[PDB]
Amino acid sequence: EQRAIDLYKQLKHRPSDHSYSDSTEMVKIIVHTVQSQDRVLKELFGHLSK
Amino acid sequence: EQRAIDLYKQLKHRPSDHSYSDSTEMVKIIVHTVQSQDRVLKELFGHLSK
Numbered sequence: 001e002q003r004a005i006d007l008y009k010q011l012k013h014r015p016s017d018h019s020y021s022d023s024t025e026m027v028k029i030i031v032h033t034v035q036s037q038d039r040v041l042k043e044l045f046g047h048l049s050k
Numbered sequence: 051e052q053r054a055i056d057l058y059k060q061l062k063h064r065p066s067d068h069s070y071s072d073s074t075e076m077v078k079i080i081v082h083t084v085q086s087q088d089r090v091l092k093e094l095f096g097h098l099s100k
């Protein structure tokens with residue numbers, strides 16, 4: 001979470017804007033959160049089944 | 051050549067734009083290429099005359 005925040009932070013506070021073209025970096029935080037989600041997600045249900 | 055490329059590269063990929071005012075740096079690569087050109091240019095013709 002904090003990661004994504006840092007990116008959105010470096011999106012406005014970055015040396016000016018209205019021209020910055022990029023987005024590949026965000027992909028990082030994006031993919032990771034997904035993997036982590038589904039992992040502990042169904043995992044939580046497991047420790048709940050008991 | 052690679053030099054100039056690096057400058058044009060730091061012209062778009064640089065931290066945003068739509069205001070960045072500068073051009074003195076490019077002068078560098080510009081002048082150098084000219085000198086080198088005319089030097090080996092007529093130089094090539096010399097090694098060709100033979």
Ligand SMILES: O=S(=O)(O)O[C@@H]1[C@@H](O)[C@H](OS(=O)(=O)O)[C@@H](CO[C@H]2O[C@H](CO[C@H]3O[C@H](CO)[C@@H](O)[C@H](OS(=O)(=O)O)[C@H]3OS(=O)(=O)O)[C@@H](O)[C@H](O)[C@H]2O)O[C@@H]1O
Nearest residue numbers: 003025027028029030031032033034035036037038039040
């Ligand atoms: O430096 S780059 O940006 O070019 O590449 C990054 C890597 O350097 C970085 O590895 S490291 O330097 O942190 O050691 C990784 C990891 O970043 C964080 O996010 C991953 C997310 O990984 C999830 O998805 C991958 C898919 O291949 C799985 O292999 C992970 O499983 S495992 O390896 O953790 O067992 C999976 O993790 S998850 O199940 O918890 O979601 C985290 O795993 C890392 O711990 C984080 O540091 O990011 C770029 O690739």
Ligand SMILES: O=S(=O)(O)O[C@@H]1[C@@H](O)[C@H](OS(=O)(=O)O)[C@@H](CO[C@H]2O[C@H](CO[C@H]3O[C@H](CO)[C@@H](O)[C@H](OS(=O)(=O)O)[C@H]3OS(=O)(=O)O)[C@@H](O)[C@H](O)[C@H]2O)O[C@@H]1O
Nearest residue numbers: 053077078079080081082083084085086087088089090091
């Ligand atoms: O010494 S500092 O770091 O403080 O400042 C450097 C300057 O001294 C340097 O100027 S200079 O010493 O090279 O003349 C500049 C520019 O260097 C870059 O270009 C040279 C190649 O020089 C070419 O352009 C100069 C321009 O005056 C010509 O005089 C050269 O022709 S000649 O005098 O050799 O006959 C010309 O050489 S060339 O025909 O072979 O192209 C490169 O060697 C450097 O690597 C470049 O940085 O850089 C600092 O400001």
